[PDB]
Design an enzyme around this catalytic site. Structure first.
Site, PDB file in Angstrom:
ATOM      1  N   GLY B  17       0.834  -1.187   0.000  1.00 22.74           N
ATOM      2  CA  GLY B  17       0.000   0.000   0.000  1.00 22.74           C
ATOM      3  C   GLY B  17       0.878   1.248   0.000  1.00 22.74           C
ATOM      4  N   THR B  18       0.232   2.422   0.092  1.00 14.76           N
ATOM      5  CA  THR B  18       0.879   3.663   0.496  1.00 14.76           C
ATOM      6  C   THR B  18       1.252   3.540   1.973  1.00 14.76           C
ATOM      7  OG1 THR B  18      -1.202   4.711   1.059  1.00 14.76           O
ATOM      8  CG2 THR B  18      -0.447   4.974  -1.234  1.00 14.76           C
ATOM      9  N   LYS B  37       1.900  -6.357   8.238  1.00 13.02           N
ATOM     10  CA  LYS B  37       1.888  -5.076   7.565  1.00 13.02           C
ATOM     11  C   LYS B  37       2.933  -4.190   8.252  1.00 13.02           C
ATOM     12  CE  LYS B  37      -2.303  -3.300   6.426  1.00 13.02           C
ATOM     13  NZ  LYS B  37      -3.353  -2.327   6.084  1.00 13.02           N
ATOM     14  N   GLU B  85      -4.432 -11.898  10.820  1.00 15.07           N
ATOM     15  CA  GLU B  85      -4.853 -13.166  10.263  1.00 15.07           C
ATOM     16  C   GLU B  85      -4.607 -13.138   8.756  1.00 15.07           C
ATOM     17  OE1 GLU B  85      -8.950 -13.920  11.313  1.00 15.07           O
ATOM     18  OE2 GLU B  85      -8.880 -15.966  10.461  1.00 15.07           O
ATOM     19  N   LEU B  87      -5.267 -14.390   4.819  1.00 11.80           N
ATOM     20  CA  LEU B  87      -6.255 -14.898   3.875  1.00 11.80           C
ATOM     21  C   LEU B  87      -5.610 -14.937   2.497  1.00 11.80           C
ATOM     22  CD1 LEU B  87      -7.950 -13.013   6.127  1.00 11.80           C
ATOM     23  CD2 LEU B  87      -9.817 -14.047   4.806  1.00 11.80           C
ATOM     24  N   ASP B  90      -7.967 -12.075  -2.513  1.00 10.65           N
ATOM     25  CA  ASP B  90      -8.932 -10.986  -2.532  1.00 10.65           C
ATOM     26  C   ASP B  90      -9.995 -11.271  -3.608  1.00 10.65           C
ATOM     27  OD1 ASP B  90      -8.406  -9.375  -5.011  1.00 10.65           O
ATOM     28  OD2 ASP B  90      -6.451  -9.066  -4.096  1.00 10.65           O
ATOM     29  N   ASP B 131     -13.898   2.572   2.082  1.00 12.38           N
ATOM     30  CA  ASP B 131     -13.142   2.124   0.917  1.00 12.38           C
ATOM     31  C   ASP B 131     -13.544   0.687   0.571  1.00 12.38           C
ATOM     32  OD1 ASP B 131     -11.389   2.766  -1.223  1.00 12.38           O
ATOM     33  OD2 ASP B 131      -9.606   2.339  -0.160  1.00 12.38           O
ATOM     34  N   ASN B 136     -10.241  -5.062  -1.370  1.00 14.53           N
ATOM     35  CA  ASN B 136     -10.156  -4.895   0.074  1.00 14.53           C
ATOM     36  C   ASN B 136     -11.031  -5.938   0.760  1.00 14.53           C
ATOM     37  OD1 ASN B 136      -8.298  -2.904   0.079  1.00 14.53           O
ATOM     38  ND2 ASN B 136      -9.727  -1.192   0.254  1.00 14.53           N
TER      39      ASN B 136
END
EC number: 2.7.11.22
Lengths: 262, 296
Positions: B17-18, B37, B85, B87, B90, B131, B136
């Site tokens: 991401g940013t 992250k 968590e 996943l 997407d 968003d 997402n």
């Protein structure tokens, strides 16, 4: 309509009542602080009101900051020379959470008249986050008030403004207001404002919502009433000045009632 | 509180991401696979970013099967590591790669129903996501789909006050945001989900605009240009213009031809112009569309 989230407002109210208990400061923290006092805290909060004014921050931001300060000072002893650093960091965090356009860090450094460095503000930001464990979405007096406002019949801006003012006044004085939950101070403020402006009392509709009656609010109402009566004499005056403004309908100029009649 | 980076073993990069970069990683003691992250701080000058402060504070309170779970926060003075968590996919990638002949209706229904559960839970905890888009929405091997990326989210008050304008990725952005309205609310997340519902059926974006005005126009050409009857106040909105072309509303069965009657009904209520009439996530859960719902 949807701006009042009819489908969620009750869920939200119940959740805030749960959270306000989690986010509550230790009532007796100040006597456990060796080097700071209620008086010093009141000076700091009054200054945060002024900072809020100078930067045109939301009132909500002001309330979050105090919540953060009081929760911090509940587990961390702070020397008087450092109290403002805590306050500054708290206002920064509250601004990044609540504001569309928070002031830059350099602006926070500037308002402390170069008492602290940017590095110090940023390290304190980090310490505050650690101590609160990033638990920043705290319920405020404001969050409850705005909901209580929906129960006015009809809406009245002087009542809303006056309630906001009285709620702000309570931020100043840890004794006695630390002992009261945001939801109760909000209730006291709404009732006192309503009574002052219109003669009316806490509505049955809000008894339904909150479970609070005039009987359960009575202790806080009596404190808040004394606070309102003495407000022209209080050492701190930044809230009174702020609420003389037309933005708030000049409510600080309204005369308090001499008696509440039970 | 509990973790440190010593116990994780990075496996591969999975995203960016940013916000920084996301890794897949393994807890070496428990075996748990996670998404890490990273949010660097020594790069930033204003300290901890407000996106991150919002993501962490909000996700710490939202414990729900259809919201991606924040497990932990490693807060060094050099880096901020968010442990989530993991996943494997997407919705966007699933649509492009495996849904080439379509997403079967049972699975569309399951996903939509889970998304609504997750969103209802957000709104009940006074959080707007702001968003929602397929990138997402994450999907696991067991058939769960979950809301992710709360960097643009916001804790709201009741009633709402003015918040950041021009939020929501453009294709998923509600008409009230596009017309500059002073206030927006939970209805903006429903609009996004409506666009997503349609997209799961067709596997293409319902309104792929390339500017604010083009986005409005595409919406108007599909649902009709709104007037005071369908939407009281619309002509008084700050960015409403009388010059707007007046397109007729087309039959909704032409908007998403393969959709059944119940589907059309629910979709229409998610894409209502008036935010006050648009269905809430909580009410949508009882729509007949879901009567036969499973989780495959």
């Amino acid at each position: 309509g949807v701006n009042e989230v009819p489908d969620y407002h009750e869920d939200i109210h119940t959740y805030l009542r749960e959270m306000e208990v989690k986010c509550k400061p230790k009532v007796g923290y100040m006597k456990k602080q060796p080097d700071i006092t209620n008086s010093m805290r009141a000076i700091l909060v009054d200054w945060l009101v002024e900072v809020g004014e100078e930067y045109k921050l939301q009132n909500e931001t002001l309330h979050l900051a105090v919540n953060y300060i009081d929760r911090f000072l509940s587990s961390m002893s702070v020397l008087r020379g450092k109290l403002q650093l805590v306050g500054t960091a708290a206002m920064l965090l509250a601004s990044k959470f609540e504001e569309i356009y928070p002031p830059e860090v350099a602006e926070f450094v500037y308002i402390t008249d170069d008492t602290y460095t940017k590095k110090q503000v940023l390290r304190m930001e980090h310490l505050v986050l650690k101590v609160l464990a990033f638990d920043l979405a705290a319920p405020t007096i404001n969050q409850f008030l705005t909901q209580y406002f929906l129960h006015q019949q009809p809406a009245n801006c002087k009542v809303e403004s006056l309630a906001m003012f009285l709620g702000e006044l309570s931020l100043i004085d840890a004794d006695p207001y630390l002992k009261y939950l945001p939801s109760v101070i909000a209730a006291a403020a709404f009732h006192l404002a309503l009574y002052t402006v219109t003669g009316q009392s806490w509505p049955e509709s809000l008894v339904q919502k909150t479970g609070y009656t005039l009987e359960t609010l009575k202790p806080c109402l009596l404190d808040l009433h004394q606070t309102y009566l003495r407000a022209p004499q209080h050492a701190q005056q930044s809230i009174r000045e702020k609420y003389k403004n037309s933005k708030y309908h000049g409510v600080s100029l309204l005369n308090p009632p001499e008696t509440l009649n039970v | 509180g509990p973790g440190s980076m010593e116990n994780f073993q990075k496996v591969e990069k999975i995203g960016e991401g940013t916000y920084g970069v996301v890794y897949k990683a393994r807890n070496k003691l428990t075996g748990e696979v996670v998404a890490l992250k990273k949010i660097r701080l020594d790069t930033e000058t204003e300290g901890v970013p407000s996106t991150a402060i919002r993501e962490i504070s909000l996700l710490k309170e939202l414990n729900h099967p259809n919201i991606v779970k924040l497990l932990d926060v490693i807060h060094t003075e050099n880096k901020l590591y968010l442990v989530f968590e993991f996943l494997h996919q997407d919705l966007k990638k699933f649509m492009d790669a495996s849904a080439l002949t379509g997403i079967p209706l049972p699975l569309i229904k399951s996903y939509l129903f889970q998304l609504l559960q997750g969103l209802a839970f957000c709104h009940s905890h006074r959080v707007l996501h702001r968003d929602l888009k397929p990138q997402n929405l994450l999907i696991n091997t067991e058939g769960a789909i979950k809301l992710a990326d709360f960097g643009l989210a916001r804790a709201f008050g009741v009633p709402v006050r003015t918040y950041t304008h021009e939020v929501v990725t453009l294709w998923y952005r509600a008409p009230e945001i596009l017309l500059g309205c002073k206030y927006y609310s939970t209805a903006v997340d429903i609009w996004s989900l409506g666009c997503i519902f349609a997209e799961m059926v067709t596997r293409r974006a319902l309104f792929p605009g390339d500017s604010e005005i083009d986005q409005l126009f595409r919406i108007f050409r599909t649902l009709g240009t709104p007037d005071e009857v369908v939407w009281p106040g619309v002509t008084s909105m700050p960015d409403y213009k009388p010059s707007f072309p007046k397109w007729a509303r087309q039959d909704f069965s032409k908007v998403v031809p393969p959709l059944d009657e119940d589907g059309r009904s629910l979709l229409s209520q998610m894409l209502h112009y008036d935010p006050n009439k648009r269905i809430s996530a909580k009410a949508a859960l009882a729509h007949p569309f879901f009567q036969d719902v499973t989780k495959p």
